[PDB]
């Protein structure tokens, strides 16, 4: 009810503002009205001029203001509403609108933005808000290029996505001792058998995996009589440094196998990267950004030369008895799609220099899509869960900035 009524008052005020020779820009909502900006308009070209006046509309249906007669009335100001302009150094006017009579009254309230003058005095004769106020409002505007003046962020806020995906572990994890001290020592024994797989950890003679080691070739590298299935809640959520470190290690190797159709792992660089399928040939990955499908050239060959692969760093972090995977996008460069380039650092700095927000955000969405997608039907031990969006209390005025910031193009992802 408050919302609709506010859009009614804003629409009435917006209609007058356009007749008066100004541009109206909506900014946010208020208790009973709206928050907006007024800008002077070139009468012929319609172009913005750069002179600003903040406007707050308060609307009411058929209600009488304080101590109202036929000659004037009084009004009590809302400090939280005026506080959105506390440091902007932009002048503010309030415009009171009523649905019964259709009356619009306005008053300059900059002095109440920085003080405690809450009692307003209105004179229905001189305080009328209508197209005849062009000269009065124009004299109240401030230049956008006056030192200390800035447009504040939007009070309605916006959403944002995090680079964290919740991991859902299986209920059981397999404990064992091993003849080998580390997995590095156990691999040559494992390769001597068949039915092999590498999503397991052996550190300090202890073995961990989400699959049963006795049902695969891993039986040759474990003490079979000491294999034991425990509740994965106890292993993955305790205070023991050895256990949390081995959980992070097992989570990574499990992820490595689960995503092996699309990406491979680089041990030295600690990087997951979309591998090539043919030398000197590009390929794309199809994922869902928002409600629309989109393609990213995860392997991009530049014919002779080098081949650029979409890469990412995975960190597994525990937050309040839950495990999460963090995705940090980057790139990896080969000479032909497989052979590593002998000077990759130079190429990474080249692509990273031009990276902007939209591109980085899109890579996070794509990598998070690849993680969640591998749990459904593409052997699958980990499920991944998207987090709710973050509700930020203040939003970047991008729409305003794309007009006014001379560097708005430098922010675009080429």
């Amino acid at each position: 009810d408050s919302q609709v009524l506010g859009e009614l008052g804003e629409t009435a005020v917006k209609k007058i503002v356009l007749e008066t020779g100004f541009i109206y820009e909506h900014r946010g909502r208020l208790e009973a009205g709206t928050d907006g900006l007024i800008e002077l308009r070139d009468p012929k070209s319609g172009a913005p001029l750069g002179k600003l006046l903040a406007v707050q509309v308060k609307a009411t249906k058929e209600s009488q203001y304080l101590r109202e007669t036929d000659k004037g009335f009084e009004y009590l100001l809302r400090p939280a509403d005026l506080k959105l302009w506390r440091l902007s150094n932009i002048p503010v006017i309030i415009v009171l609108w009523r649905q019964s009579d259709g009356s619009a009254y306005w008053k300059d309230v900059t002095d109440s933005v920085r003080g405690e003058e809450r009692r307003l005095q209105f004179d229905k004769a001189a305080d009328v808000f209508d197209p005849g106020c062009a000269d009065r409002l124009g004299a109240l505007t401030v230049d956008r290029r006056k030192p200390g003046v800035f447009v504040p962020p939007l009070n309605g806020g916006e959403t944002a996505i995090i680079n964290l995906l919740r991991i859902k572990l299986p209920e059981e994890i397999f404990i064992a001792t091993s003849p080998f001290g580390s997995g590095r020592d156990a691999v040559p024994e494992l390769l001597k058998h068949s039915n092999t797989r590498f999503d397991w950890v052996i550190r300090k003679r202890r073995y961990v995996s989400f699959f049963d080691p006795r049902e695969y070739g891993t039986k040759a590298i474990v003490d079979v009589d000491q294999v034991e299935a425990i509740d994965s809640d106890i292993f993955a959520f305790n205070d023991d440094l050895d256990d949390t470190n081995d959980t992070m290690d097992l989570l990574r190797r499990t992820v490595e196998r689960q995503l092996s159709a699309q990406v491979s792992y680089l041990r030295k660089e600690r990087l997951f990267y979309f591998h090539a399928v043919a030398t000197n040939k590009s390929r794309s990955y199809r994922y869902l950004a928002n409600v629309k499908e989109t393609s990213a050239k995860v392997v991009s060959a530049y014919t002779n030369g080098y081949v650029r692969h979409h890469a990412a760093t995975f960190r597994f972090e525990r937050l309040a008895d839950e495990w999460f995977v963090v995705v940090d996008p980057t790139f990896y460069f080969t000479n032909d799609g497989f052979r590593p380039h002998r000077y990759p650092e130079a190429l990474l700095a080249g692509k990273k220099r031009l990276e902007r927000n939209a591109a980085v955000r899109g890579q996070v969405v794509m990598w998070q899509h690849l993680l969640v997608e591998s749990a459904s039907c593409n052997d699958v031990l980990l499920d991944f869960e998207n987090l709710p969006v973050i509700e930020l209390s203040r939003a970047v005025p991008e729409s305003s900035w794309t007009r006014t910031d001379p560097r708005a193009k430098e922010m675009e992802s080429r």
Binding site: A160, E317, N357, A358
Partner: protein, 470 residues
């Protein structure tokens, strides 16, 4: 996940004047505590050209410099000059006989040395002598500007490509260490644009471009800070001299056994820093992950509070300790022992992660607002860099990456209060007048003094004045 967008931290500028922007606040109110007749005496070392070139730029600075483009007037302001609208309310004067000239041959001699390490050592020895001669009662300079010729800086400073250690000596780091016993802060500037030099890698070729007004702001603010004057004060609402911020860091020696040494960087709300050198550190694995024992952390905190008491004559009521590595149980124990002994009943231990991969992303081309704070179940994601409403843009090009703040369980304060203070501590600036810096001052000073103190032998007493390390 709880999210807040902090207001830009307010600063007190004098006569009670309050503003979020260091530049605009100085223009409107002046500095915090000016005295009638304030003057910064500036010595100059360089060649005849660069000395005369610096005198020219100081004159245009005094006359006032217009902005190149006033579309982003807050990010690209005018400089109102050093007259009636002097933002520092202070004179900047080169006294008579306060200039030492480097001969044309001395410049060529260094440029021609084939081994880089020898060229640096010869340059440091040359400038240290000219510095010492200037301080032999010739004048009493409060700060000395080093205007080395462009080819000399290019000889001494390695180049990195436009896109983009200890294998080579760092001229700036060795110079600051070799001249620390002389009680002068120095400012190395390029003799063409008059901005900071030798602190970061240079480009292969110098551009001919301008933003002279901004460079004037940055140069005078650096000379102002180096002279020991306070431009403004942080946390205006909070009672002053109550809370102090004690950064604890480590640097690794190069000779001997490559032992680590603990350092302390304690700042007040007036942006003044005290630098103290503690005991050698333990290490967790193979000489890495430096840490302090409880006895050594106790000693370092106690030596720090004592230096705070010698300069401010009273003991702080709260001490926020900042580290870039997690607090060892020994460190938390030693800090508590030292503070309880001195009767300091309020303390917060904050682990500040510079390189956390966790990030949050908004929909659009502009990045997250600076001051955005996301509570990640006891871990604080804080955006000290990002979109700045006051500037009307995002001043960077590469995307920002947030800090991750992890307060210790021994802390008294809530996570959101500590994050806001960390945000405020990023405003203490000795190098620029643009307030959107990533690191809080105690952590920034740790890296800067570590690069200098590793050239001063362990056991040698060092000056506590941070302004002489900048």
């Amino acid at each position: 996940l709880k999210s807040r967008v902090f207001d830009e931290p307010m600063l007190e500028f004098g006569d009670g004047g309050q503003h979020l922007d260091p530049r605009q606040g100085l223009r409107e109110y002046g500095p915090l505590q000016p005295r009638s007749g304030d003057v910064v005496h500036v010595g100059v070392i360089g060649t005849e050209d660069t000395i005369a070139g610096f005198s020219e730029f100081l004159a245009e600075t005094a006359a006032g410099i217009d902005s190149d483009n006033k579309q982003l007037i807050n990010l690209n302001p005018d400089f109102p000059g050093l007259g009636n609208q002097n933002p520092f309310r202070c004179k900047f004067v080169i006294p008579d006989g306060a200039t030492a000239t480097i001969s044309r041959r001395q410049v060529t001699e260094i440029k021609q040395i084939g081994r880089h390490d020898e060229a640096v050592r010869r340059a440091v020895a040359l400038i240290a002598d000219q510095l010492s001669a200037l301080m032999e009662s010739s004048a009493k300079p409060d700060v000395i500007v080093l205007a080395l010729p462009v080819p000399l800086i290019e000889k001494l400073v390695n180049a990195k490509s436009e896109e983009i250690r200890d294998d080579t000596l760092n001229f700036r780091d060795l110079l600051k260490a070799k001249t620390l016993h002389l009680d002068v802060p120095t400012q190395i500037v390029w003799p063409d644009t008059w901005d900071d030099a030798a602190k970061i890698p240079r480009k292969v070729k110098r551009d001919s471009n301008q933003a002279k007004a901004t460079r004037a702001w940055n140069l005078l603010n650096a000379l102002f800070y180096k002279a020991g004057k306070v431009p403004w004060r942080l946390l205006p609402d909070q009672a002053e001299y109550r809370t102090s911020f004690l950064g604890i860091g480590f640097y690794r020696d190069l000779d001997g056994q490559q032992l680590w040494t603990s350092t302390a960087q304690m700042f007040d709300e007036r942006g003044r820093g005290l630098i103290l050198r503690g005991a050698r550190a333990q290490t967790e694995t193979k000489g890495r992950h430096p840490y302090l024992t409880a006895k050594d952390a106790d000693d370092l905190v106690t030596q720090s509070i004592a230096a705070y008491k010698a300069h401010h004559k009273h003991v702080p009521a709260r001490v926020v300790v900042l580290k870039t590595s997690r607090f060892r149980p020994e460190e938390a124990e030693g800090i508590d022992s030292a503070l309880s002994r001195l009767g300091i009943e309020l303390s917060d231990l904050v682990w500040v992660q510079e390189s956390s991969p966790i990030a949050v992303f908004r929909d659009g081309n502009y990045p997250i607002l600076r001051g955005t704070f996301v509570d990640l179940k006891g871990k604080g994601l804080l955006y000290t860099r990002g979109s700045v409403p006051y500037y009307g843009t995002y001043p960077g090009l590469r995307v920002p990456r947030p800090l991750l703040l992890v307060p210790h369980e021994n802390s008294d304060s809530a996570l959101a209060r500590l994050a806001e203070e960390v945000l405020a501590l990023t405003k203490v600036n000795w190098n620029t007048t643009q307030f959107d810096q990533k690191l809080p001052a105690p952590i920034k000073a740790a890296r800067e003094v570590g690069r200098i103190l590793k050239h001063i032998e362990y056991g040698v007493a060092i000056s506590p004045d941070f302004r002489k390390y900048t």
